[PDB]
Amino acid sequence: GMSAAKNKLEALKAMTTVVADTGDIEAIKQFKPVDATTNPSLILKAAKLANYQHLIEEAIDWALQIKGNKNSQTTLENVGDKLAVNIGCEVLTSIPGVISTEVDARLSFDTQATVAKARKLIRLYQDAGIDSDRILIKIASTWEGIQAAKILEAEGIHCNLTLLFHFAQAQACAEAGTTLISPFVGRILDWYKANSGQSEYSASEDPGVVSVTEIYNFYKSHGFKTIVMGASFRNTGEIEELAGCDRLTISPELLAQLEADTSPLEQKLFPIKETKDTPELLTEASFRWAMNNDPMAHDKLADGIRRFAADQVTLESMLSKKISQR
Amino acid sequence: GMSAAKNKLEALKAMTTVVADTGDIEAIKQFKPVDATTNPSLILKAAKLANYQHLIEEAIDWALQIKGNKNSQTTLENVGDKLAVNIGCEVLTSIPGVISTEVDARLSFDTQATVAKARKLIRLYQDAGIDSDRILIKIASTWEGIQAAKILEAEGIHCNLTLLFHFAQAQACAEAGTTLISPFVGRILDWYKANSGQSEYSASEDPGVVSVTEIYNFYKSHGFKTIVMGASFRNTGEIEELAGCDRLTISPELLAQLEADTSPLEQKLFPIKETKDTPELLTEASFRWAMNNDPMAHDKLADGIRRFAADQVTLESMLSKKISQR
Cα nearest neighbour of B205 on chain A: A204
Q: CA A124 to CA A106: how far, in whole Å?
A: 20
Q: Which of B326, B322, B306, B5 is nearest to B142 (CA)?
A: B306
Q: Which residues of chain B lie closer than 8 angstroms to A267, CB-CB? A: 217, 221
Reported as half-sphere exposure (CB side, CA atoms, 13 A), residue B202 has a value of 11
**Inter-chain residue contact A1 with B217, CB threshold 8 Å:** no
Domains of chain B: 1-326 (3.20.20.70)
Bridge-based pairing state of the strands A35-37 and A17-21: parallel
**Inter-chain residue contact A272 with B272, CB threshold 8 Å:** yes
Contacts of B232 (CB under 8 A, 6+ apart): B21, B182, B184, B185, B186, B187, B249
Catalytic residue among B138, B150, B220, B300: B138
Q: CA A170 to CA A294: how far, in whole Å?
A: 14
Q: CA A94 to CA A47: how far, in whole Å?
A: 18
Specify whether the CB–CB gap between A163 and A146 falls below 8 A. Answer: no
Torsions phi, psi for A172 (to 5 deg): -60, -40
Give the one of A2, A167, A273 whose C-beta lies nearest to B271's C-beta. Answer: A273
Q: Which residues of chain A lie closer than 8 angstroms to B220, CB-CB? A: 270
Q: Is A151 helix (H, G, I), strand (E, B) or coil?
A: helix
Resolution of this entry in Å?
A: 2.8
Distance (Å) from the C-alpha of residue A110 to the closest C-alpha of chain B?
29
Cα nearest neighbour of B168 on chain A: A2
Contacts of A8 (CB under 8 A, 6+ apart): A236, A240, A258, A259, A261, A262, A263, A265
Q: How many CB atoms lie within 10 A of CB B1?
A: 13
**Inter-chain residue contact B272 with A276, CB threshold 8 Å:** no
For this structure, is B138 an active site residue?
Answer: yes
Q: Is B100 helix (H, G, I), strand (E, B) or coil?
A: strand
Q: Can you give the C-alpha Rg of chain B in angstroms?
A: 20
The secondary structure of residue A134, as a DSSP letter, is G
Reported as half-sphere exposure (CB side, CA atoms, 13 A), residue A260 has a value of 7
**Inter-chain residue contact A275 with B273, CB threshold 8 Å:** no
Q: Is A163 helix (H, G, I), strand (E, B) or coil?
A: strand
Give the one of A221, A270, A279 whose C-beta lies nearest to B221's C-beta. Answer: A270
**Inter-chain residue contact A266 with B214, CB threshold 8 Å:** yes
Q: Which residues of chain B lie closer than 8 angstroms to A204, CB-CB? A: 202, 204-205, 210
Mutate one of A192, A201, A204, A275 to test the B interface: name it (highest B CB count within 10 A). A204
**Inter-chain residue contact B279 with A218, CB threshold 8 Å:** no
The secondary structure of residue A133, as a DSSP letter, is G
Contacts of B305 (CB under 8 A, 6+ apart): B105, B108, B140, B142, B163
Q: CA B60 to CA B67: how far, in whole Å?
A: 10
Torsions phi, psi for A187 (to 5 deg): -75, -30
- Helix (H) or strand (E) run with residue B209 in it: helix B207-221
Cβ pairs bridging A and B (under 8 Å): 57
Give the one of B210, B266, B280 whose C-beta lies nearest to A1's C-beta. Answer: B280
Give the one of B204, B217, B279 whose C-beta lies nearest to A1's C-beta. Answer: B279
Structure determined by: X-ray
Q: What is the dihedral of CA B314, B319, B324, B326, to 10 degrees?
A: 170
Q: CA B295 to CA A233: how far, in whole Å?
A: 34
Q: Which residues of chain A lie closer than 8 angstroms to B270, CB-CB? A: 217, 220-221, 270, 272-273
**Inter-chain residue contact A266 with B202, CB threshold 8 Å:** no
**Inter-chain residue contact B1 with A267, CB threshold 8 Å:** no
Q: Which residues pair with A17 in a beta bridge?
A: A247
**Inter-chain residue contact A276 with B217, CB threshold 8 Å:** no
CA geometry: angle at B260 spanning B256 and B261, to 5°?
120
Specify whether the CB–CB gap between B145 and B114 falls below 8 A. Answer: yes
Cα nearest neighbour of A272 on chain B: B272
Chain centre distance of CA A219: 18
Q: Which residues of chain B lie closer than 8 angstroms to A224, CB-CB? A: none
Q: Which residues of chain B lie closer than 8 angstroms to A220, CB-CB? A: 270
* Helix, strand and coil percent figures for chain B, each rounded to 5: 55, 10, 35
**Inter-chain residue contact A272 with B277, CB threshold 8 Å:** no
Distance (Å) from the C-alpha of residue B10 to the closest C-alpha of chain A?
18
Which residues of A are known to be catalytic? 138
List of long-range contacts for B315-321, beta carbons under 8 Å, 24+ apart: B315/B40, B315/B43, B315/B44, B315/B47, B315/B80, B315/B83, B316/B76, B316/B77, B316/B80, B318/B47, B319/B56, B319/B59, B319/B60, B319/B76, B319/B79, B319/B80, B319/B83, B320/B76
Q: Which residues of chain A lie closer than 8 angstroms to B168, CB-CB? A: none
**Inter-chain residue contact B205 with A210, CB threshold 8 Å:** no
Q: Distances in Å between the alpha carbon of B172 and those of A213, B38, B42, B181, B215?
A: 30, 23, 27, 11, 12
Give the one of B202, B222, B273 whose C-beta lies nearest to A273's C-beta. Answer: B273
Distance (Å) from the C-alpha of residue B9 to the closest C-alpha of chain A?
21
**Inter-chain residue contact B270 with A205, CB threshold 8 Å:** no
Q: Which residues of chain B lie closer than 8 angstroms to A271, CB-CB? A: 221, 272-273, 275
Query: What is B22-58 written as a DSSP string?
Result: -S-HHHHHHH--SEEE--HHHHHHHHT-GGGHHHHHH
Cα nearest neighbour of A269 on chain B: B217
Distance (Å) from the C-alpha of residue A71 to the closest C-alpha of chain B?
50
Q: Is A317 helix (H, G, I), strand (E, B) or coil?
A: helix
Q: Which residues of chain A lie closer than 8 angstroms to B267, CB-CB? A: 217, 221
Cα nearest neighbour of A279 on chain B: B1
**Inter-chain residue contact B270 with A217, CB threshold 8 Å:** yes
